Amino acid sequence: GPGEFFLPPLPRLLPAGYHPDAARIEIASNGWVRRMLADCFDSEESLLFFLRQRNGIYGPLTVPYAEADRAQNIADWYQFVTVIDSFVSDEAALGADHAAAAETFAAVVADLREGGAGGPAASLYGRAAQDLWRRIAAGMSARQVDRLVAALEAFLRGCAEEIVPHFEACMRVRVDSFGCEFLELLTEYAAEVDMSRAATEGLFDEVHHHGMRQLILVNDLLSWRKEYAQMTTVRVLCEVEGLELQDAVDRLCALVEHHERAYITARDAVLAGPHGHREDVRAYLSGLDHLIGGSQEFEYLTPRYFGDGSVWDGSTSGWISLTASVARFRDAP
Amino acid sequence: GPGEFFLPPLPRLLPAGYHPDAARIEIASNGWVRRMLADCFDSEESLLFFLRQRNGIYGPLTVPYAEADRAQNIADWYQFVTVIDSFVSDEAALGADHAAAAETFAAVVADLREGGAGGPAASLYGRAAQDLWRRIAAGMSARQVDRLVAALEAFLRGCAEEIRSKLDKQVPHFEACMRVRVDSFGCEFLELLTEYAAEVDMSRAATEGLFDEVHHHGMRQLILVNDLLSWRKEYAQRDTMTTVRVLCEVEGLELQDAVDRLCALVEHHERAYITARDAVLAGPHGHREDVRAYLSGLDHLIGGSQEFEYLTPRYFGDGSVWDGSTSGWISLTASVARFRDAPAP
Ligand code: NA
Ligand code: NA
Ligand code: NA
């Protein structure tokens, strides 16, 4: 096996800012995870393992421009989806199997839209979902709440089902599963805009295609240690195309740059076009800029990817152990 | 011995603010610790144990009003002082007889005194101290630089007295404990660094004793809160210089009685700090922008130090993650601790 690969400097063209309250939001998010989601963990050990991933600072890194309340709401949302994704591992815990998922999660979310706790199916996470719905729905248009309903249903269905021929079919499945519709809706929420109409008309089809593909590729690169040990572009290149790891990494880093520059081109085309003068469109596009820059800053930071025990030292390029329990970028092999 | 104690709600009357770049300053401060101090630790794994304590967020929690560069300088200083404190506090690293202790300690003293010298340092502590001195002394008046020299000397005198208290197996009476800890806690450092962060020079006012009451009560508040939040980690260790040990072993109090007494004392000194501060603010210097900036700086030092001490795994155990709770039952025996609303049955 390789045991060690080199991650070169990535373009990092887009703003990566921290919310002015990022450190405090991470702690208050951690507090909310204990209060609302403790029962999803089989012990204090498992909860703290999760809290050590610092998932609570993702929100403030993606929406550094947002009002503190909305930044807290998004930080708690992302911890919530990560807990349910990673730690709610039983059809009993989630409230449905793959068979029952559709009509079950339709009724859970129907109940949440009404201000309830999503009923017996949602027993270990419905108080959590209710608290987030209360906070977030209040600052959303009714169209946005329709979209949140569909987004949360798909997410829980996606979870129930979880219990390639080529690279592009990998990209298609990574895009369908990354939660892009959530990210897009929450970007609108943070920026206090409603892009519901412009988005159905396809104004953002190109910026979303490149934006989300950049997010996914950066994520596949920085999550490769975690995934190697457990559906990802790195695995497709190595196994389906038979590339050496370093060649796969080099290919994916160049692909990050392709989609990053193409995102900027496509964003600039909307800014130059007949909706580009609109302030809400500008605010949304700045939102996506900070989501893309901030997600990558977050992905360097998290012990979810560098191993429980790791503490980021700010290094972003160099040699990294594929296998070691705890990793960091070293300036030599 | 008791297995737990109850920490009642403390007054928490003073502002605990985070620097707007706090998260980022912590990471960069972790980077400085690896670049300058990696070789102070026995391994990568002991370096990570130290980095997991989040000592890098102390700076941004105590000078949230400062410019980012000065906040970074203070963040790095506090991490460095925490390393020095853990080395001199460690009988194995230092020596557990006078002779061996004194030789090791003399090397630490000589290394840190290289900080403000003209020739390059050879030691790990010397190069770290030189780096921090060059960054900080650049933002200081000549009088503040002399005071920085005196602050290091005060800190080292205090460390020497804490070391001797272990060697001689002697718990000080409360007033001798507080008198040592004003040195060992680095109060002169914190005062000067608070002027530096606020970009003021209080050298003249301090010489005239404008802040004697403000300092007396504010520093006592800081030391007492630190003693309460550090007890979990200090309780099994021996002859350490903490008022919890003074009240238990010198004055014969049961742990919970000692804790309750020290919480009453935190509130005494915290209210006396606010009264003393308000007197300066109402007095013939109280309109001065620099005086007001300094006292606002001490408010944030006092509030932020307490916030930091609740969050750090240095106190709540490696692997702990603060949930924001500030009062309740705390285990002395658990490998990780947090405040609970019931005792262990
Ligand atoms: Na902050
Ligand atoms: Na996980
Ligand atoms: Na690192």
CA proximity to A122, closest of A49, A114, A176: A114
Query: Hey, what are A303's tokens?
Result: 């012990």
C-beta of residue A300 within 8 angstroms of C-beta of residue A248 = no
3-state secondary structure at position B328: strand
The CA–CA distances, whole Å, from B327 to A167, B270, B314, B339 equal 53, 17, 18, 6
Chain B partners within 8 Å of A24 (Cβ): 18
C-beta of residue B214 within 8 angstroms of C-beta of residue B297 = no
3-state secondary structure at position B330: strand
Site of tokens 């400085």: B32
- Between CA A172 and CA A236 the distance in angstroms is 13
Query: Hey, what are A179's tokens?
Result: 């939660």
C-beta of residue B94 within 8 angstroms of C-beta of residue B87 = yes
Helices and strands: H and E segment counts in chain B: 16, 2
Interacting residues of B192 by C-beta distance below 8 A, sequence separation 6+: B140, B144, B147, B148, B151
- Which residues, listed in sequence order, are joined to residue B331 by a DSSP beta bridge? B4
Task: Nearest by CB to B321, from A24, A30, A311: name it.
Answer: A30
Across the interface, whether the CB atoms of A31 and B319 are under 8 A apart is answered no
Across the interface, whether the CB atoms of A57 and B325 are under 8 A apart is answered no
Question: Is residue B8 exposed (0-12), middle (13-18) or buried (19+ Cβ within 10 Å)?
Answer: exposed
CA proximity to B51, closest of B68, B71, B32: B32
Interacting residues of B236 by C-beta distance below 8 A, sequence separation 6+: B332
Task: Nearest by CB to B48, from A34, A51, A309: name it.
Answer: A309
Residue B20 near chain A (CB below 8 Å) = yes
Chain centroid to Cα A20, Å, comes to 21
Chain centroid to Cα A272, Å, comes to 29
Return the residue of B nearest to A297 by Cα: B24
Return the residue of B nearest to A46 by Cα: B319
Residue B25 near chain A (CB below 8 Å) = no
Chain centroid to Cα B175, Å, comes to 19
Calculate the dihedral angle through the C-alpha atoms of A91, A95, A98, A103, rounding to the nearest 10 degrees: 170
Chain A partners within 8 Å of B29 (Cβ): none
Task: Nearest by CB to B311, from A21, A27, A52: name it.
Answer: A27
C-beta of residue A213 within 8 angstroms of C-beta of residue A171 = yes
C-beta of residue B104 within 8 angstroms of C-beta of residue B94 = yes
- Between CA A303 and CA A292 the distance in angstroms is 20
- Between CA A35 and CA A33 the distance in angstroms is 6
For B284, list phi and psi in degrees, rounded to 5. -75, 0
Task: Nearest by CB to B28, from A22, A30, A314: name it.
Answer: A314
Output the CA A306–ligand 3 centroid distance in Å.
8
Given CA atoms B11, A48, A322, A169 in this order, what sign does their dihedral have? negative
The CA–CA distances, whole Å, from A306 to A71, A99, B31 equal 25, 36, 15
To the nearest 10 degrees (0 to 180), the angle between helices A22-37 and A44-51 is: 150
Across the interface, whether the CB atoms of A312 and B30 are under 8 A apart is answered yes
Output the CA B228–ligand 3 centroid distance in Å.
32
Interacting residues of B70 by C-beta distance below 8 A, sequence separation 6+: B63, B139, B196, B197, B199
Query: Hey, what are B68's tokens?
Result: 């980012």
Pick among A306, A310, A313 to test the B interface (most B CBs inside 10 A): A313
Query: Hey, what are B60's tokens?
Result: 């941004």
C-beta of residue A20 within 8 angstroms of C-beta of residue A62 = no
Across the interface, whether the CB atoms of A31 and B57 are under 8 A apart is answered no
User: Where are the extended beta strands (E) located within chain B?
Assistant: 4-7, 328-331
| DSSP character string of B116-147 | G-SSPP-SHHHHHHHHHHHHHHTTS-HHHHHH
Task: Nearest by CB to A23, from B34, B57, B323: name it.
Answer: B57
Resolution (A): 2.0
C-beta of residue A236 within 8 angstroms of C-beta of residue A314 = no
| DSSP character string of A62-101 | H-TTS-HHHHHHHHHHHHHHHHHHHH--SHHHHS--TTTH
- Between CA A311 and CA A53 the distance in angstroms is 10
CA angle A144, A72, A192 (to 5 degrees): 35
Chain A partners within 8 Å of B31 (Cβ): 313-315
Residue A44 near chain B (CB below 8 Å) = yes
Across the interface, whether the CB atoms of A48 and B320 are under 8 A apart is answered yes
- Which residues, listed in sequence order, are joined to residue B109 by a DSSP beta bridge? none
C-beta of residue A190 within 8 angstroms of C-beta of residue A288 = no
C-beta of residue A286 within 8 angstroms of C-beta of residue A203 = no
Residue B340 near chain A (CB below 8 Å) = no
3-state secondary structure at position B236: coil
Pairing verdict, β A318-321 and A4-7: antiparallel
CA proximity to B30, closest of B20, B17, B41: B41
Interacting residues of A117 by C-beta distance below 8 A, sequence separation 6+: A111, A126, A127, A129, A130
CA proximity to B94, closest of B186, B160, B34: B160
- Number of Cβ within 10 Å of residue A99's Cβ equals 10
The CA–CA distances, whole Å, from B239 to B123, B162, B254 equal 30, 9, 17
Helical residues (DSSP H) of A191-328, grouped into ranges: 196-200, 205-222, 224-228, 233-235, 245-272, 279-301, 303-306
Which domains are present in chain A? 4-321 (1.10.600.10)
Return the residue of B nearest to A303 by Cα: B52
The CA–CA distances, whole Å, from B232 to B12, B105, B145, B336 equal 20, 26, 37, 10
What type of residue sits at position A272?
A
C-beta of residue B90 within 8 angstroms of C-beta of residue B50 = no
To the nearest 10 degrees (0 to 180), the angle between helices B22-37 and B124-137 is: 140
Across the interface, whether the CB atoms of A23 and B60 are under 8 A apart is answered yes
For A330, list phi and psi in degrees, rounded to 5. -105, 140
3-state secondary structure at position B18: coil
CA proximity to B188, closest of B162, B164, B163, B218: B218
Residue B337 near chain A (CB below 8 Å) = no
Task: Tell me the shortest Cα–Cα distance from B100 to chain A, in angstroms.
Answer: 34
CA angle B9, B13, B19 (to 5 degrees): 110
Across the interface, whether the CB atoms of A27 and B320 are under 8 A apart is answered no
Query: Hey, what are B151's tokens?
Result: 């602050």
Site of tokens 């975690």: A226
3-state secondary structure at position B6: strand
Task: Tell me the shortest Cα–Cα distance from A333 to chain B, in angstroms.
Answer: 16
C-beta of residue A111 within 8 angstroms of C-beta of residue A118 = yes
3-state secondary structure at position A26: helix
CA proximity to A84, closest of A187, A182, A160: A160
Return the residue of A nearest to B54 by Cα: A311
The CA–CA distances, whole Å, from A189 to A30, A143, B336 equal 22, 12, 37
Task: Tell me the shortest Cα–Cα distance from B30 to chain A, in angstroms.
Answer: 5
